[PDB]
Amino acid sequence: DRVTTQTAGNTAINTQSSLGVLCAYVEDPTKSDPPSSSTDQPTTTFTAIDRWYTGRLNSWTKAVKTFSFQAVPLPGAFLSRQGGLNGGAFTATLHRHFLMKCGWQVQVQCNLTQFHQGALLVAMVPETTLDVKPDGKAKSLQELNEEQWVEMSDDYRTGKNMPFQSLGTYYRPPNWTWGPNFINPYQVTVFPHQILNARTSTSVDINVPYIGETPTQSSETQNSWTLLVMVLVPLDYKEGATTDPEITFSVRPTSPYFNGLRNRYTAG
Protein backbone atom coordinates (compact mmCIF):
# COMPACT_ATOMS: atom_id res chain seq x y z
CA ASP A 1 0.00 0.00 0.00
CA ARG A 2 2.87 2.32 -1.03
CA VAL A 3 4.79 1.58 2.22
CA THR A 4 7.38 -1.20 2.17
CA THR A 5 10.57 -2.14 3.99
CA GLN A 6 13.26 -4.41 2.55
CA THR A 7 15.48 -6.31 4.99
CA ALA A 8 18.70 -8.25 4.51
CA GLY A 9 21.50 -9.19 6.88
CA ASN A 10 22.23 -6.27 9.20
CA THR A 11 20.67 -3.64 6.92
CA ALA A 12 17.15 -2.45 6.14
CA ILE A 13 15.73 0.03 3.62
CA ASN A 14 12.31 1.66 3.50
CA THR A 15 10.21 4.05 1.41
CA GLN A 16 7.11 6.18 1.95
CA SER A 17 5.93 5.90 -1.68
CA SER A 18 6.51 2.70 -3.67
CA LEU A 19 5.19 1.51 -7.03
CA GLY A 20 6.20 -2.17 -6.96
CA VAL A 21 9.11 -4.49 -7.67
CA LEU A 22 9.84 -5.58 -11.24
CA CYS A 23 11.08 -9.14 -11.79
CA ALA A 24 13.06 -9.41 -15.00
CA TYR A 25 12.26 -12.71 -16.72
CA VAL A 26 11.27 -15.44 -14.24
CA GLU A 27 8.93 -16.03 -11.31
CA ASP A 28 11.73 -16.19 -8.69
CA PRO A 29 14.93 -14.53 -9.96
CA THR A 30 16.81 -15.63 -6.83
CA LYS A 31 16.69 -19.38 -7.54
CA SER A 32 19.91 -20.58 -9.16
CA ASP A 33 22.01 -23.73 -9.50
CA PRO A 34 25.78 -24.09 -9.13
CA PRO A 35 27.82 -23.94 -12.34
CA SER A 36 28.53 -27.15 -14.23
CA SER A 37 31.85 -26.07 -15.79
CA SER A 38 34.09 -26.58 -12.74
CA THR A 39 34.69 -29.49 -10.40
CA ASP A 40 36.19 -27.91 -7.27
CA GLN A 41 34.14 -27.12 -4.18
CA PRO A 42 32.39 -23.75 -4.62
CA THR A 43 31.77 -21.01 -2.05
CA THR A 44 28.13 -20.09 -1.52
CA THR A 45 26.79 -17.04 0.32
CA PHE A 46 27.70 -16.25 3.92
CA THR A 47 25.90 -13.90 6.26
CA ALA A 48 28.51 -11.12 5.99
CA ILE A 49 27.79 -10.33 2.32
CA ASP A 50 23.98 -10.31 2.35
CA ARG A 51 23.77 -6.53 2.44
CA TRP A 52 22.90 -3.37 0.55
CA TYR A 53 25.83 -1.18 -0.52
CA THR A 54 25.17 2.52 -1.10
CA GLY A 55 26.87 5.15 -3.24
CA ARG A 56 26.45 8.64 -4.65
CA LEU A 57 26.04 9.84 -8.24
CA ASN A 58 26.50 13.30 -9.69
CA SER A 59 23.78 15.88 -9.18
CA TRP A 60 21.00 16.68 -11.63
CA THR A 61 20.94 20.24 -12.97
CA LYS A 62 18.60 22.19 -15.24
CA ALA A 63 21.31 22.87 -17.84
CA VAL A 64 21.36 19.20 -18.91
CA LYS A 65 19.97 18.54 -22.39
CA THR A 66 17.76 15.63 -23.46
CA PHE A 67 18.90 11.99 -23.62
CA SER A 68 22.02 12.69 -21.56
CA PHE A 69 22.86 9.65 -19.46
CA GLN A 70 25.04 8.21 -16.71
CA ALA A 71 26.29 4.63 -16.51
CA VAL A 72 27.46 2.34 -13.71
CA PRO A 73 29.03 -1.06 -14.57
CA LEU A 74 27.93 -3.25 -11.70
CA PRO A 75 30.85 -5.65 -11.04
CA GLY A 76 33.28 -2.92 -12.08
CA ALA A 77 31.89 -0.33 -9.69
CA PHE A 78 33.27 -2.15 -6.65
CA LEU A 79 36.65 -2.67 -8.29
CA SER A 80 37.00 0.98 -9.33
CA ARG A 81 35.42 2.58 -6.22
CA GLN A 82 33.16 4.66 -8.43
CA GLY A 83 30.95 7.15 -6.62
CA GLY A 84 32.48 6.23 -3.28
CA LEU A 85 31.18 2.66 -3.39
CA ASN A 86 33.10 0.16 -1.27
CA GLY A 87 32.11 -3.47 -0.87
CA GLY A 88 34.25 -4.47 2.09
CA ALA A 89 33.75 -8.21 2.48
CA PHE A 90 32.30 -8.67 -1.00
CA THR A 91 35.21 -6.82 -2.60
CA ALA A 92 37.76 -8.75 -0.54
CA THR A 93 36.26 -12.08 -1.59
CA LEU A 94 35.94 -11.00 -5.22
CA HIS A 95 39.62 -10.06 -5.36
CA ARG A 96 40.58 -13.61 -4.28
CA HIS A 97 38.95 -15.83 -6.89
CA PHE A 98 39.05 -16.54 -10.60
CA LEU A 99 35.35 -17.09 -11.40
CA MET A 100 32.11 -15.50 -10.25
CA LYS A 101 28.39 -15.51 -11.03
CA CYS A 102 25.45 -13.76 -9.37
CA GLY A 103 22.26 -11.84 -9.94
CA TRP A 104 21.55 -8.35 -8.64
CA GLN A 105 19.01 -6.11 -6.95
CA VAL A 106 19.12 -2.34 -7.39
CA GLN A 107 17.18 0.70 -6.23
CA VAL A 108 17.52 4.42 -6.91
CA GLN A 109 16.34 7.40 -4.87
CA CYS A 110 15.46 11.01 -5.67
CA ASN A 111 13.85 13.83 -3.69
CA LEU A 112 11.71 15.87 -6.06
CA THR A 113 8.57 17.52 -4.68
CA GLN A 114 5.14 18.45 -6.02
CA PHE A 115 6.38 21.83 -7.32
CA HIS A 116 8.97 20.44 -9.78
CA GLN A 117 8.76 19.08 -13.32
CA GLY A 118 10.93 16.42 -14.91
CA ALA A 119 11.33 12.75 -15.67
CA LEU A 120 14.14 10.20 -15.50
CA LEU A 121 14.37 6.75 -17.08
CA VAL A 122 16.15 3.96 -15.19
CA ALA A 123 16.93 0.74 -17.05
CA MET A 124 19.39 -2.16 -16.88
CA VAL A 125 21.15 -2.47 -20.24
CA PRO A 126 22.82 -5.88 -20.67
CA GLU A 127 26.14 -6.28 -22.48
CA THR A 128 27.15 -2.65 -22.99
CA THR A 129 30.42 -0.73 -23.32
CA LEU A 130 29.47 2.78 -22.22
CA ASP A 131 32.13 2.80 -19.47
CA VAL A 132 35.15 2.79 -21.82
CA LYS A 133 36.78 5.79 -23.43
CA PRO A 134 37.07 5.93 -27.24
CA ASP A 135 40.77 5.01 -27.00
CA GLY A 136 39.67 1.80 -25.26
CA LYS A 137 40.82 2.46 -21.68
CA ALA A 138 38.56 2.61 -18.64
CA LYS A 139 37.59 6.11 -17.55
CA SER A 140 39.51 7.52 -14.59
CA LEU A 141 37.82 9.15 -11.61
CA GLN A 142 39.03 12.54 -12.86
CA GLU A 143 37.09 12.27 -16.13
CA LEU A 144 33.78 11.89 -14.29
CA ASN A 145 34.22 15.21 -12.47
CA GLU A 146 34.61 16.91 -15.87
CA GLU A 147 32.02 15.08 -17.99
CA GLN A 148 29.32 15.43 -15.35
CA TRP A 149 26.63 14.04 -17.67
CA VAL A 150 27.52 12.04 -20.76
CA GLU A 151 26.54 13.82 -23.96
CA MET A 152 24.53 12.17 -26.74
CA SER A 153 25.54 12.41 -30.40
CA ASP A 154 25.58 10.52 -33.68
CA ASP A 155 28.77 8.75 -32.61
CA TYR A 156 27.02 7.07 -29.69
CA ARG A 157 23.88 6.61 -31.77
CA THR A 158 25.77 4.58 -34.40
CA GLY A 159 28.49 2.93 -32.32
CA LYS A 160 31.08 4.63 -34.53
CA ASN A 161 33.49 5.17 -31.61
CA MET A 162 33.77 1.66 -30.16
CA PRO A 163 37.05 0.21 -28.89
CA PHE A 164 39.45 -0.08 -31.79
CA GLN A 165 42.03 -2.66 -32.86
CA SER A 166 44.90 -0.79 -34.50
CA LEU A 167 45.25 -2.11 -38.05
CA GLY A 168 48.92 -1.32 -38.59
CA THR A 169 50.44 0.43 -41.59
CA TYR A 170 50.53 -2.40 -44.15
CA TYR A 171 46.87 -1.66 -44.86
CA ARG A 172 45.19 1.68 -45.60
CA PRO A 173 42.86 2.94 -42.83
CA PRO A 174 39.20 2.74 -43.87
CA ASN A 175 36.20 4.87 -42.90
CA TRP A 176 34.33 3.53 -39.86
CA THR A 177 30.59 4.06 -40.04
CA TRP A 178 28.81 1.54 -37.80
CA GLY A 179 29.33 -0.88 -34.93
CA PRO A 180 27.33 -3.52 -33.04
CA ASN A 181 27.22 -1.60 -29.72
CA PHE A 182 25.21 1.39 -30.99
CA ILE A 183 22.63 2.97 -28.66
CA ASN A 184 19.11 3.73 -29.90
CA PRO A 185 17.56 6.27 -27.49
CA TYR A 186 13.96 5.84 -28.61
CA GLN A 187 13.97 2.10 -27.83
CA VAL A 188 15.59 2.07 -24.39
CA THR A 189 12.26 1.13 -22.80
CA VAL A 190 12.72 -2.43 -24.10
CA PHE A 191 14.95 -3.39 -21.18
CA PRO A 192 13.58 -3.84 -17.66
CA HIS A 193 12.94 -0.32 -16.43
CA GLN A 194 10.82 2.07 -14.40
CA ILE A 195 10.02 5.72 -15.09
CA LEU A 196 10.64 8.32 -12.37
CA ASN A 197 8.93 11.71 -12.42
CA ALA A 198 8.23 14.49 -9.94
CA ARG A 199 4.51 13.96 -9.44
CA THR A 200 4.29 10.22 -8.77
CA SER A 201 7.14 8.57 -6.85
CA THR A 202 10.69 8.93 -5.56
CA SER A 203 12.23 5.45 -5.96
CA VAL A 204 12.45 2.57 -8.43
CA ASP A 205 13.29 -1.07 -7.69
CA ILE A 206 14.35 -3.69 -10.25
CA ASN A 207 15.23 -7.36 -9.76
CA VAL A 208 17.46 -9.12 -12.28
CA PRO A 209 18.79 -12.70 -12.73
CA TYR A 210 22.12 -13.90 -14.12
CA ILE A 211 22.97 -14.02 -17.82
CA GLY A 212 26.12 -14.91 -19.71
CA GLU A 213 27.42 -16.67 -22.78
CA THR A 214 29.03 -19.32 -20.53
CA PRO A 215 27.88 -20.74 -17.19
CA THR A 216 30.45 -18.50 -15.52
CA GLN A 217 32.70 -15.56 -16.38
CA SER A 218 36.11 -14.32 -15.30
CA SER A 219 36.01 -12.23 -12.14
CA GLU A 220 38.19 -9.36 -13.32
CA THR A 221 36.48 -8.61 -16.66
CA GLN A 222 32.80 -9.67 -16.81
CA ASN A 223 30.46 -6.78 -17.61
CA SER A 224 27.14 -8.45 -18.44
CA TRP A 225 24.77 -6.06 -16.64
CA THR A 226 24.95 -2.27 -16.50
CA LEU A 227 22.84 0.38 -14.79
CA LEU A 228 21.58 3.29 -16.87
CA VAL A 229 19.99 6.65 -16.07
CA MET A 230 18.70 8.96 -18.80
CA VAL A 231 16.81 12.24 -19.09
CA LEU A 232 13.44 12.28 -20.85
CA VAL A 233 12.01 15.68 -19.85
CA PRO A 234 14.52 18.37 -18.79
CA LEU A 235 14.06 19.72 -15.28
CA ASP A 236 12.30 23.00 -14.61
CA TYR A 237 11.05 24.73 -11.48
CA LYS A 238 9.77 28.13 -10.42
CA GLU A 239 12.30 30.71 -9.29
CA GLY A 240 13.24 30.37 -5.62
CA ALA A 241 12.69 26.63 -5.15
CA THR A 242 15.31 24.04 -4.24
CA THR A 243 18.01 23.59 -6.87
CA ASP A 244 20.28 20.78 -8.05
CA PRO A 245 18.60 17.67 -6.61
CA GLU A 246 20.79 14.81 -5.42
CA ILE A 247 20.75 11.16 -6.51
CA THR A 248 21.73 7.93 -4.75
CA PHE A 249 21.50 4.19 -5.34
CA SER A 250 21.98 0.89 -3.54
CA VAL A 251 22.91 -2.60 -4.76
CA ARG A 252 22.66 -6.15 -3.47
CA PRO A 253 24.08 -9.43 -4.83
CA THR A 254 22.04 -12.61 -4.74
CA SER A 255 22.95 -16.31 -4.95
CA PRO A 256 26.68 -15.76 -5.59
CA TYR A 257 29.22 -18.44 -6.40
CA PHE A 258 33.00 -18.48 -6.60
CA ASN A 259 35.65 -20.84 -7.92
CA GLY A 260 39.38 -20.99 -8.43
CA LEU A 261 40.87 -19.70 -5.20
CA ARG A 262 44.19 -17.86 -5.43
CA ASN A 263 46.07 -14.96 -3.88
CA ARG A 264 45.34 -11.27 -4.36
CA TYR A 265 45.05 -10.23 -7.99
CA THR A 266 47.76 -7.99 -9.42
CA ALA A 267 47.94 -6.43 -12.86
CA GLY A 268 50.99 -6.95 -15.05
Binding site: G20, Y171, W176, P180
Partner: protein, 258 residues
Amino acid sequence: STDNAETGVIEAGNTDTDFSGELAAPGSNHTNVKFLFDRSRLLNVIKVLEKDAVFPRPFPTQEGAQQDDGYFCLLTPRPTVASRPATRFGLYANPSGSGVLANTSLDFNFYSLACFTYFRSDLEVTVVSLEPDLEFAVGWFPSGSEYQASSFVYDQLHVPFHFTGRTPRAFASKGGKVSFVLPWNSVSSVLPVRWGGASKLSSATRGLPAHADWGTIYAFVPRPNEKKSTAVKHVAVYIRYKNARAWCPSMLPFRSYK
Protein backbone atom coordinates in the same frame (compact mmCIF):
# COMPACT_ATOMS: atom_id res chain seq x y z
CA SER B 1 -8.51 3.42 -20.08
CA THR B 2 -6.81 4.70 -16.93
CA ASP B 3 -3.40 3.17 -16.26
CA ASN B 4 0.08 3.90 -14.90
CA ALA B 5 2.96 3.54 -17.36
CA GLU B 6 5.62 4.11 -14.70
CA THR B 7 5.12 0.54 -13.45
CA GLY B 8 6.79 -0.81 -16.61
CA VAL B 9 4.19 -3.55 -17.08
CA ILE B 10 1.20 -2.55 -19.22
CA GLU B 11 -1.49 -5.04 -20.25
CA ALA B 12 -2.38 -5.07 -23.94
CA GLY B 13 -6.02 -4.38 -24.75
CA ASN B 14 -8.55 -4.63 -27.57
CA THR B 15 -11.12 -2.41 -29.25
CA ASP B 16 -13.96 -3.64 -27.04
CA THR B 17 -12.39 -2.35 -23.80
CA ASP B 18 -13.64 1.22 -24.24
CA PHE B 19 -15.96 0.98 -27.27
CA SER B 20 -18.45 -1.47 -28.75
CA GLY B 21 -16.68 -4.00 -30.95
CA GLU B 22 -14.95 -7.36 -31.14
CA LEU B 23 -11.52 -8.93 -31.55
CA ALA B 24 -10.08 -10.10 -34.86
CA ALA B 25 -9.09 -13.64 -35.82
CA PRO B 26 -5.48 -14.84 -35.47
CA GLY B 27 -4.45 -15.07 -39.12
CA SER B 28 -0.97 -16.47 -39.77
CA ASN B 29 2.21 -16.99 -37.74
CA HIS B 30 4.98 -15.82 -40.08
CA THR B 31 6.73 -14.03 -37.20
CA ASN B 32 8.00 -17.29 -35.67
CA VAL B 33 11.72 -16.94 -35.00
CA LYS B 34 12.59 -20.44 -36.21
CA PHE B 35 10.63 -19.99 -39.44
CA LEU B 36 11.96 -16.49 -40.11
CA PHE B 37 15.69 -17.19 -40.28
CA ASP B 38 15.76 -20.32 -42.50
CA ARG B 39 16.60 -18.54 -45.75
CA SER B 40 19.87 -18.39 -47.65
CA ARG B 41 21.66 -15.12 -48.30
CA LEU B 42 24.95 -13.78 -49.61
CA LEU B 43 27.79 -13.34 -47.12
CA ASN B 44 31.09 -12.66 -48.90
CA VAL B 45 33.04 -13.06 -52.14
CA ILE B 46 36.56 -14.52 -52.17
CA LYS B 47 39.28 -15.48 -54.62
CA VAL B 48 40.47 -18.99 -55.54
CA LEU B 49 43.83 -20.40 -54.48
CA GLU B 50 46.29 -21.58 -57.13
CA LYS B 51 49.25 -22.44 -54.87
CA ASP B 52 50.26 -22.83 -51.24
CA ALA B 53 49.08 -19.88 -49.16
CA VAL B 54 50.45 -17.87 -46.25
CA PHE B 55 47.87 -17.01 -43.62
CA PRO B 56 47.74 -13.28 -42.79
CA ARG B 57 49.56 -12.22 -39.64
CA PRO B 58 47.94 -10.48 -36.65
CA PHE B 59 46.78 -6.88 -36.92
CA PRO B 60 49.86 -5.04 -35.60
CA THR B 61 51.57 -6.10 -38.84
CA GLN B 62 53.96 -3.49 -40.21
CA GLU B 63 54.91 -2.97 -43.85
CA GLY B 64 56.98 -5.30 -46.00
CA ALA B 65 55.53 -8.57 -44.70
CA GLN B 66 54.69 -11.14 -47.37
CA GLN B 67 51.36 -12.96 -47.21
CA ASP B 68 48.18 -13.69 -49.16
CA ASP B 69 45.10 -11.50 -48.69
CA GLY B 70 41.46 -11.99 -49.56
CA TYR B 71 41.61 -15.79 -49.88
CA PHE B 72 39.86 -16.81 -46.64
CA CYS B 73 36.33 -16.11 -45.42
CA LEU B 74 35.03 -16.33 -41.87
CA LEU B 75 31.63 -17.82 -41.05
CA THR B 76 30.01 -15.33 -38.70
CA PRO B 77 27.34 -12.60 -38.89
CA ARG B 78 29.58 -10.19 -36.98
CA PRO B 79 31.81 -7.66 -38.77
CA THR B 80 35.24 -8.85 -39.87
CA VAL B 81 38.32 -7.37 -41.54
CA ALA B 82 41.27 -9.01 -43.29
CA SER B 83 39.93 -12.50 -42.54
CA ARG B 84 40.00 -11.80 -38.79
CA PRO B 85 37.29 -10.73 -36.34
CA ALA B 86 36.71 -7.02 -35.86
CA THR B 87 34.48 -4.62 -33.94
CA ARG B 88 33.77 -1.76 -36.36
CA PHE B 89 32.58 -2.14 -39.94
CA GLY B 90 34.73 -0.55 -42.63
CA LEU B 91 34.17 1.14 -45.98
CA TYR B 92 36.51 2.63 -48.59
CA ALA B 93 34.97 5.85 -49.92
CA ASN B 94 38.15 6.92 -51.75
CA PRO B 95 39.86 4.04 -53.56
CA SER B 96 43.23 5.73 -54.06
CA GLY B 97 46.70 5.92 -52.57
CA SER B 98 49.17 3.33 -51.36
CA GLY B 99 48.49 0.49 -48.95
CA VAL B 100 46.62 -2.79 -49.25
CA LEU B 101 42.83 -2.56 -49.13
CA ALA B 102 41.19 -4.55 -46.34
CA ASN B 103 38.42 -7.01 -47.10
CA THR B 104 35.22 -6.51 -45.10
CA SER B 105 31.87 -8.21 -44.59
CA LEU B 106 28.63 -8.12 -42.59
CA ASP B 107 25.18 -9.72 -42.46
CA PHE B 108 22.85 -6.84 -43.27
CA ASN B 109 19.58 -8.74 -42.82
CA PHE B 110 20.69 -10.45 -39.62
CA TYR B 111 21.67 -7.16 -38.02
CA SER B 112 18.51 -5.50 -39.35
CA LEU B 113 16.46 -8.07 -37.43
CA ALA B 114 18.94 -8.55 -34.55
CA CYS B 115 16.48 -7.71 -31.78
CA PHE B 116 18.04 -10.02 -29.16
CA THR B 117 21.34 -10.55 -27.32
CA TYR B 118 22.35 -14.22 -27.72
CA PHE B 119 21.94 -16.64 -30.60
CA ARG B 120 22.58 -20.27 -31.50
CA SER B 121 21.89 -22.38 -34.58
CA ASP B 122 23.35 -24.82 -37.06
CA LEU B 123 24.47 -23.51 -40.44
CA GLU B 124 24.32 -24.75 -44.04
CA VAL B 125 26.82 -23.51 -46.61
CA THR B 126 26.77 -23.27 -50.39
CA VAL B 127 29.20 -21.92 -52.97
CA VAL B 128 28.71 -20.69 -56.53
CA SER B 129 31.04 -19.71 -59.35
CA LEU B 130 31.28 -16.24 -60.89
CA GLU B 131 33.25 -17.33 -63.97
CA PRO B 132 32.10 -19.32 -67.02
CA ASP B 133 32.91 -23.04 -66.85
CA LEU B 134 35.23 -23.12 -63.85
CA GLU B 135 36.57 -26.09 -61.88
CA PHE B 136 37.23 -25.56 -58.18
CA ALA B 137 37.03 -27.09 -54.72
CA VAL B 138 36.25 -25.88 -51.20
CA GLY B 139 37.93 -26.60 -47.87
CA TRP B 140 37.08 -26.01 -44.24
CA PHE B 141 38.47 -26.35 -40.73
CA PRO B 142 36.75 -25.82 -37.37
CA SER B 143 36.93 -22.88 -34.99
CA GLY B 144 40.17 -22.55 -33.07
CA SER B 145 42.64 -24.12 -35.50
CA GLU B 146 44.98 -23.03 -38.29
CA TYR B 147 45.72 -23.73 -41.94
CA GLN B 148 48.73 -25.91 -42.77
CA ALA B 149 51.10 -24.19 -45.21
CA SER B 150 53.50 -26.37 -47.19
CA SER B 151 53.69 -28.69 -50.18
CA PHE B 152 55.02 -32.08 -51.27
CA VAL B 153 56.83 -33.27 -54.39
CA TYR B 154 55.23 -36.03 -56.47
CA ASP B 155 56.98 -36.85 -59.76
CA GLN B 156 58.68 -33.44 -59.61
CA LEU B 157 55.25 -31.77 -59.38
CA HIS B 158 54.57 -29.77 -56.22
CA VAL B 159 51.24 -30.53 -54.55
CA PRO B 160 49.92 -28.29 -51.74
CA PHE B 161 49.12 -30.05 -48.49
CA HIS B 162 45.59 -28.64 -48.22
CA PHE B 163 44.55 -31.38 -50.64
CA THR B 164 44.50 -33.93 -47.80
CA GLY B 165 43.29 -33.96 -44.16
CA ARG B 166 40.64 -35.55 -41.93
CA THR B 167 38.40 -32.34 -41.95
CA PRO B 168 35.97 -32.01 -44.93
CA ARG B 169 37.17 -31.27 -48.54
CA ALA B 170 34.62 -31.32 -51.48
CA PHE B 171 34.83 -31.28 -55.33
CA ALA B 172 32.32 -30.19 -57.96
CA SER B 173 31.92 -31.01 -61.64
CA LYS B 174 32.03 -28.45 -64.45
CA GLY B 175 29.66 -25.67 -63.49
CA GLY B 176 28.43 -27.53 -60.42
CA LYS B 177 27.58 -26.38 -56.91
CA VAL B 178 28.80 -27.41 -53.46
CA SER B 179 26.44 -27.80 -50.51
CA PHE B 180 26.63 -29.22 -46.99
CA VAL B 181 25.73 -28.43 -43.38
CA LEU B 182 27.87 -27.93 -40.27
CA PRO B 183 27.20 -28.25 -36.54
CA TRP B 184 27.62 -25.71 -33.75
CA ASN B 185 31.23 -26.36 -32.74
CA SER B 186 32.43 -23.32 -30.79
CA VAL B 187 33.43 -23.75 -27.15
CA SER B 188 31.02 -21.02 -26.05
CA SER B 189 27.45 -22.15 -25.50
CA VAL B 190 25.92 -19.28 -27.49
CA LEU B 191 27.04 -16.66 -29.99
CA PRO B 192 26.96 -13.08 -28.61
CA VAL B 193 25.36 -10.58 -30.97
CA ARG B 194 26.84 -7.81 -28.81
CA TRP B 195 29.54 -8.26 -26.18
CA GLY B 196 31.22 -6.18 -23.50
CA GLY B 197 33.85 -8.47 -21.99
CA ALA B 198 37.53 -9.12 -22.63
CA SER B 199 39.20 -12.38 -23.66
CA LYS B 200 42.80 -11.95 -22.49
CA LEU B 201 43.42 -11.11 -18.84
CA SER B 202 45.45 -8.00 -19.71
CA SER B 203 46.21 -5.77 -22.69
CA ALA B 204 42.94 -6.98 -24.22
CA THR B 205 40.52 -5.02 -26.41
CA ARG B 206 37.12 -4.82 -24.74
CA GLY B 207 34.12 -6.03 -26.70
CA LEU B 208 36.02 -8.32 -29.09
CA PRO B 209 34.95 -11.97 -28.72
CA ALA B 210 37.47 -14.72 -29.42
CA HIS B 211 35.50 -17.64 -30.93
CA ALA B 212 32.20 -16.23 -32.23
CA ASP B 213 32.02 -18.10 -35.52
CA TRP B 214 31.53 -21.55 -37.02
CA GLY B 215 34.85 -22.05 -38.82
CA THR B 216 36.64 -20.92 -41.97
CA ILE B 217 36.31 -21.57 -45.69
CA TYR B 218 38.51 -21.24 -48.77
CA ALA B 219 38.60 -22.37 -52.39
CA PHE B 220 41.38 -23.78 -54.55
CA VAL B 221 42.02 -25.12 -58.04
CA PRO B 222 42.86 -28.86 -58.18
CA ARG B 223 46.07 -28.51 -60.16
CA PRO B 224 49.77 -28.57 -59.22
CA ASN B 225 51.83 -25.48 -58.51
CA GLU B 226 53.18 -25.61 -62.07
CA LYS B 227 49.91 -24.29 -63.54
CA LYS B 228 49.57 -20.84 -61.95
CA SER B 229 47.40 -18.97 -64.45
CA THR B 230 47.42 -15.26 -65.33
CA ALA B 231 43.89 -14.14 -64.34
CA VAL B 232 42.19 -13.97 -60.96
CA LYS B 233 38.97 -15.83 -60.18
CA HIS B 234 36.17 -15.36 -57.67
CA VAL B 235 33.39 -17.34 -55.99
CA ALA B 236 30.38 -16.43 -53.85
CA VAL B 237 29.41 -17.85 -50.46
CA TYR B 238 25.87 -18.46 -49.20
CA ILE B 239 24.83 -19.32 -45.64
CA ARG B 240 21.50 -20.28 -44.11
CA TYR B 241 20.80 -20.63 -40.40
CA LYS B 242 18.88 -23.71 -39.33
CA ASN B 243 16.84 -24.36 -36.19
CA ALA B 244 17.64 -20.97 -34.68
CA ARG B 245 16.94 -19.69 -31.17
CA ALA B 246 17.14 -16.36 -29.32
CA TRP B 247 17.51 -15.55 -25.64
CA CYS B 248 17.28 -11.86 -24.62
CA PRO B 249 15.70 -8.70 -26.11
CA SER B 250 17.67 -5.71 -27.38
CA MET B 251 17.27 -2.70 -29.69
CA LEU B 252 17.46 -2.27 -33.46
CA PRO B 253 19.69 0.02 -35.55
CA PHE B 254 19.13 3.77 -35.77
CA ARG B 255 17.39 4.74 -39.02
CA SER B 256 18.72 8.24 -39.59
CA TYR B 257 16.20 11.02 -40.38
CA LYS B 258 17.22 12.97 -43.44
